[PDB]
Amino acid sequence: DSTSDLIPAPPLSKVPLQQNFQDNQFQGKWYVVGLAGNAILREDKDPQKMYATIYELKEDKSYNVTSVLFRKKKCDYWIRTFVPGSQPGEFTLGNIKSYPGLTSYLVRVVSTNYNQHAMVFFKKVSQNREYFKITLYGRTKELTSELKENFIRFSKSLGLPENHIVFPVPIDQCIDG
Numbered sequence: 001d002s003t004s005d006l007i008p009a010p011p012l013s014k015v016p017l018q019q020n021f022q023d024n025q026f027q028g029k030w031y032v033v034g035l036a037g038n039a040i041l042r043e044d045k046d047p048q049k050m051y052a053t054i055y056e057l058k059e060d061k062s063y064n065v066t067s068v069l070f071r072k073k074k075c076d077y078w079i080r081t082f083v084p085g086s087q088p089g090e091f092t093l094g095n096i097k098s099y100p101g102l103t104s105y106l107v108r109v110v111s112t113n114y115n116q117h118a119m120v121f122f123k124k125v126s127q128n129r130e131y132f133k134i135t136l137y138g139r140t141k142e143l144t145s146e147l148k149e150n151f152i153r154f155s156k157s158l159g160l161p162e163n164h165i166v167f168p169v170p171i172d173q174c175i176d177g
């Protein structure tokens with residue numbers, strides 16, 4: 001039982017796809033340097049900590065995707081599969097049936113230069129609620145003001161105000177491995 005009110009997901013036509021996406025070059029570790037979405041809310045109290053996400057390309061060209069978070073004084077590891085979707089750089093979540101309430105989960109790589117930064121769009125329908133976010137990934141924990149301004153501009157183009165954009169605080173626990 002619940003009530004919630006969400007900013008509507010944008011149409012996919014507003015979400016670019018990285019041209020000539022290179023699945024091998026996207027592999028390895030990325031830090032989550034920025035997050036924006038309709039369930040992201042900037043909170044001065046308990047600021048969001050940076051986490052890292054590792055993409056490994058499998059034989060069948062799916063990704064094993066592992067996020068590492070520091071929570072309650074320990075490293076917490078979330079492992080899932082991204083299955084290639086309708087075009088290069090687009091994916092859906094593998095094994096959707098295994099996640100209660102989940103009916104769709106879409107990933108689109110918007111832009112990346114592979115060796116410094118990426119922006120990736122996610123849309124999920126869970127218990128019939130449509131959540132979306134944009135993740136700004138960096139190969140390092142810092143990115144330029146330019147890249148952050150680009151991220152903010154892109155987020156706003158998808159109907160997100162500034163208070164639904166956060167920049168997780170760099171940490172050293174867990175994510176330096």
Ligand SMILES: O=C(NCCCN(CCCCN(CCCNC(=O)c1cccc(=O)n1O)C(=O)c1cccc(=O)n1O)C(=O)c1cccc(=O)n1O)c1cccc(=O)n1O
Nearest residue numbers: 037038039040051067069078099122123124126131132133
């Ligand atoms: O709105 C979104 N995110 C902002 C709020 C995140 N959050 C607060 C943080 C929670 C902490 N965890 C989750 C870590 C564990 N994860 C999961 O066992 C998981 C299983 C199945 C689907 C799924 O999505 N998750 O996360 C992250 O920090 C984390 C890290 C890396 C990737 C990732 O996805 N998450 O969440 C939520 O509780 C939340 C609310 C609504 C939808 C949703 O998916 N999540 O995770 C969102 C929109 C569209 C796709 C999507 O995956 N997300 O998370």
Ligand SMILES: [Cl-]
Nearest residue numbers: 032053067135
């Ligand atoms: Cl992630």
Ligand SMILES: [Sm+3]
Nearest residue numbers: 122124131133
């Ligand atoms: Sm999630």
